[PDB]
Design a protein around this ligand. Sequence first.
Ligand SMILES: O=C(Nc1ccc([N+](=O)[O-])cc1Cl)c1cc(Cl)ccc1O
Ligand SMILES: *[C@@H]1O[C@H](CO)[C@@H](O)[C@H](O)[C@H]1NC(C)=O
Ligand SMILES: *[C@@H]1O[C@H](CO)[C@@H](O)[C@H](O)[C@H]1NC(C)=O
Ligand SMILES: *[C@@H]1O[C@H](CO)[C@@H](O)[C@H](O)[C@H]1NC(C)=O
Ligand SMILES: [Ca+2]
Ligand SMILES: [Ca+2]
Ligand SMILES: [Ca+2]
Lengths: 709, 665
Amino acid sequence: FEEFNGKPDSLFFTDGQRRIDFILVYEDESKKENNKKGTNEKQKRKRQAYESNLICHGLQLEATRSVSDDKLVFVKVHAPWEVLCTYAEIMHIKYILDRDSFFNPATRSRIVYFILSRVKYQVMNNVNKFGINRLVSSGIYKAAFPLHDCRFNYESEDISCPSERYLLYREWAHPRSIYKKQPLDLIRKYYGEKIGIYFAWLGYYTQMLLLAAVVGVACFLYGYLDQDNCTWSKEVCDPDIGGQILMCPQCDRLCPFWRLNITCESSKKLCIFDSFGTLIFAVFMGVWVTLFLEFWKRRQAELEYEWDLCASAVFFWILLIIASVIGIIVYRLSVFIVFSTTLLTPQMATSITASIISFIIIMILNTIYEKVAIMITNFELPRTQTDYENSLTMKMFLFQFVNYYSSCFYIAFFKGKFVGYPGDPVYLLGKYRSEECDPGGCLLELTTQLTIIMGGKAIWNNIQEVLLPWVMNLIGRYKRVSGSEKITPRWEQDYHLQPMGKLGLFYEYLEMIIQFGFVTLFVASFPLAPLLALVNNILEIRVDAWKLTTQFRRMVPEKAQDIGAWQPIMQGIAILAVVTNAMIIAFTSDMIPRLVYYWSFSIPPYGDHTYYTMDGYINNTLSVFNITDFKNTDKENPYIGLGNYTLCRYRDFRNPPGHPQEYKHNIYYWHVIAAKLAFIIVMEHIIYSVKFFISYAIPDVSKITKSKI
Amino acid sequence: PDSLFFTDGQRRIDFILVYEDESKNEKQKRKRQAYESNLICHGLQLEATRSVSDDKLVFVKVHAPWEVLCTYALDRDSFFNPATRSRIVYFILSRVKYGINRLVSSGIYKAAFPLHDCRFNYESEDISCPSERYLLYREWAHPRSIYKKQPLDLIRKYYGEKIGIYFAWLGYYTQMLLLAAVVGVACFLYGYLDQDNCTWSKEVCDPDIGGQILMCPQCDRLCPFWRLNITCESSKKLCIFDSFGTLIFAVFMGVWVTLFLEFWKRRQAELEYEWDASAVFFWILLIIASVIGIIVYRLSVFIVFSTLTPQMATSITASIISFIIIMILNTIYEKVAIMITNFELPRTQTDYENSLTMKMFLFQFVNYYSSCFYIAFFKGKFVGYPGDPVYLLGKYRSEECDPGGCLLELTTQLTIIMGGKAIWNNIQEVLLPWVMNLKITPRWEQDYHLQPMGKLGLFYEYLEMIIQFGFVTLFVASFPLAPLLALVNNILEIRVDAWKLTTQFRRMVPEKAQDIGAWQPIMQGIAILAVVTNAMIIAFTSDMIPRLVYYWSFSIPPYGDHTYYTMDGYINNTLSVFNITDFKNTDKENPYIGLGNYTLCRYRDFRNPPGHPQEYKHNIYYWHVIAAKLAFIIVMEHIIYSVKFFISYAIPDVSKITKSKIKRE
Ligand SMILES: O=C(Nc1ccc([N+](=O)[O-])cc1Cl)c1cc(Cl)ccc1O
Ligand SMILES: *[C@@H]1O[C@H](CO)[C@@H](O)[C@H](O)[C@H]1NC(C)=O
Ligand SMILES: *[C@@H]1O[C@H](CO)[C@@H](O)[C@H](O)[C@H]1NC(C)=O
Ligand SMILES: *[C@@H]1O[C@H](CO)[C@@H](O)[C@H](O)[C@H]1NC(C)=O
Ligand SMILES: [Ca+2]
Ligand SMILES: [Ca+2]
Ligand SMILES: [Ca+2]
């Protein structure tokens, strides 16, 4: 029941003394009512009842019609001394100058939101209805939000106003300040503890990632600068050793005989990514995770001081299993179709294309999995909102984990690991030939599937992050092409911003946790992952700040001293990382066979060399299969007509033709597997013991906090 | 006349202050005068009574006027319990400084203690007396009440919360040991009924197999070629403790530990809700203690041997000597731990207790388990072929086990140590009078005639219980009957501890505690170590993996001759061969020379035979077995840990009733 005063950036009522805390917006009742008048009148009486109750509770309200549309009506709110102080006393809110000194607008909005949520408006049939969500869900209220100080780009016209949003845009947001340390105190003052904790966690995470990236770059540099000493690569590239070894066709009819020379580039890359530096980096990451968690616990203190039925479970657990089942299948089919369409290196282009296709399908399935998780959680009746979001966390994390990680787990553990000798190929259930890796293995394949997935996730998420709000706002503006182009107040143009749905930072935390999973689980195959994480986080801080400050309405401040249900997830991933890295190094990498050959099979008893040497590894490790020993009566003529050669070599430790044991696993195979298992056990035990010692030694609480009290 | 109260006066005792008069130098008289004047002026009543037995030993009592005690903090004396009154008065006395403990230590007071209600043997003469002590003794302490339930509430009301929680923990441990023991005996019986189907033991007794296998001197110079069939009775005994029943029992104990921890946490939660530098030096001592234990065990077995029935008697006597020397070393270990923790000078008493208990537990742990760990893992696991035996130090040969293994005699050592310790300790504390069985003075004088605990009795009881738990959970694969032994031990321990506390020990000041103490972390550490210890025990100490590998792989035409899977020929197709002409690659003195026409012998190892290109080298079977062992360890550890975590997550840790109370309250 008021008109626009004339000042566009006003943060006060028309009088200029009462501060606006919340804006209530609803559609005018004079519109062209359709369907039934009953619903319109009921929602009406509900809105007058709620407003009358709010005024009775002691809140001043003023409204004014929209300057552009005749139907939009905005209703304002205010909280004087008495009610504010009374509610501060009631809710245990823990040198007074003025209103804008000790009751900051964030706390004022929090108190007003509490009052508006706790107020009742109507009781019928002896049932009590209350909660602001019901008003919006029933269509009574279009929205309800507080106001920003001013525009992000230009300073506030009010001289008294601090224009905090301008400071956030200049210093914190905007890529101009890509280097300055973010002012977490200002974030807490302006957005609340929920945002400040998230951004402090992001900053600390990216710092620890910088440390990890420095160490990983050191290890990668050690691997790269030491190349001429990687003897097996020289043997593979040598046309007198590698070129004379006739590898054995991997598939049945689409594969000719091939020589081991062609894989020289892949051998060099493996030498880079399969050195002892990678093992040292895995060992270091083992303690790095513990240091990260413990020092985050310490920071989580200074920050608290400084800033005060099972049917749906089994079903959802079965929805995560079928998701994993379809992920592996889609990866395999993408690889197969890319290979069939095959006409720098052709084996580097095929891998890149297959990984790109798989990443595209995973990104497509992400949204479907999100919707399925929402549907499953809604079926269950949450006890409270906290349990709702906790269940959503536990389901979405598993779904996302099973996506990309079931994508990589296959390459690591079930790619060419249970395939027999050519005489008796292993078929899963018929004509399902089990493909196997090159003599080098699928370490490089996994490293390529991992880097493409990480980069694609980062880039696509960031582009979606900054664009979807932008395009939404642009089209919303396009809906009012009428040439108004005039001065307008703050509230109506804040209503044009996005609502910033109830989930909040759920998606940001989810993406950061998935990135943590990539960087911590498979670090035994890609030491450069922490650098990717560092770059991604450096961009993400500014991306999130910009999107929150420019293309989203002001969240009602809520406060929490912990990030939430993600911390148990971080602990679980920390526990699983050691096992995953141990298995990766044991099986996905050929380090253990190389060490075994160097120490026990390059000597006169086994090899022919006087002293330990790494020479002869390739020739003495590869096996032999006779062409005419192909069993099975079906498909006798895959390639028997060629007859160009007679013996083919394959990547497996089996006895040669002749011998009492034709093609059974030999002593070398059992030595290698025993060494692998001993390595796994020793690494796991040492890493866990060191982690326990480090956790026990550190006080787990800040020293200065103890000093002050 | 055995009166609890003042002479012809209504006032209830809380403590007694005794001293010896200087009449039988005057510094003690002046100290006593100053202390008495300060106490009297402080606002507490006192009365002096000369001991009937000796006039020199003058006893002085105190009281607690209600106004003073209330100010410092149906009937007036029924609102507070006597235990609470005694605790309040003790706190008041501690708050004053001349430190009652300092006066006691400096001779100012001979003792300071509260009083019991009445004699345990006879009921209180006073009809008004509740006679709580007599009823408590008859129904809970005397062994005739062994099978009655434990009145926890009464016990806490009389003594305090510490005693109540200790006894509740002991009772619940016994209750869970009931299930552990029934499952263990079920597994043992299952193994026992399968003696006839134990193929390899029957092969060992079968002379056509056992007697035709000439083993090579297991010892040095002495022990000439010994046939194998002489130990098939030992093999028969071993076949019971080496069956799948032990594996099943270990798997079951893996989850039983989790149940014990989780439900014990629920018990704690319910009880809490219902009621209102020099470190390197210590580690060196630990290392030397472990080495000393190993050395003494080795020397004991050496002296026993160098002098069915023979080997069993030698093992038993070696176990007794090891147990005796361990018990002897225990006193020195306690003394040194106390001294070294005293040199640290902790500021308070709680930190002193924690430091003492951690070091005490570590010393006991090494002293008791060093022999077991050596005889399980480091015995007969790195001795090479007889041609080049391993002398790691020089002239100190490493002993080796029989073809079956050292598991049976490891179980002998465990059974001897556990049982001997318990029985010995029991009799030492208080079981002499009962077997042997099978004027008037005031109450304060009677209590003064008695002796107190010493501030470490509860710590010792907890220590012995934790060591028993360690024996039960760590080496459970070897000895599945350990839980039954623990069950009986605790069944007697509850009653014996109650009896000694109620009869031979002075009344203690009550205290509260929110948990048993620093012992729970010991329990989680013990469980985490026990899982891996059992994994390695089953993998290495027991020959269950070699025989499974033989059954599944080497009874098949590619490596064997049997038409289908079977254990036939395991003994003869697993033992290695040694040629005497290769006596010593070192060209040194050999004992094999001569001794008849014998030219070859067999030994416990999976090496290649003479004449093979890689003769006397580990063969394919050895590597197969090692891979199987490592894989079994990995699988067992991972599955056990996953199951434990799943159970921990599944259990909400609450009775589901706390939420109802929250809603109502
Ligand atoms: O990600 C890869 N390489 C890479 C990534 C980053 C840097 N760098 O210096 O920033 C340098 C390199 Cl060679 C990569 C490596 C291999 Cl073997 C195969 C495919 C790849 O796509
Ligand atoms: C072991 O076998 C030999 C001959 O085969 C024999 O005479 C001896 O009595 C056997 N041992 C036992 C305990 O029967
Ligand atoms: C037992 O093993 C030896 C090892 O060469 C073999 O000669 C002998 O034949 C085996 N026993 C039987 C009954 O064949
Ligand atoms: C043991 O080695 C000597 C070395 O010449 C050989 O003569 C003898 O035959 C071997 N023993 C057997 C049982 O073959
Ligand atoms: Ca992102
Ligand atoms: Ca005892
Ligand atoms: Ca639990």
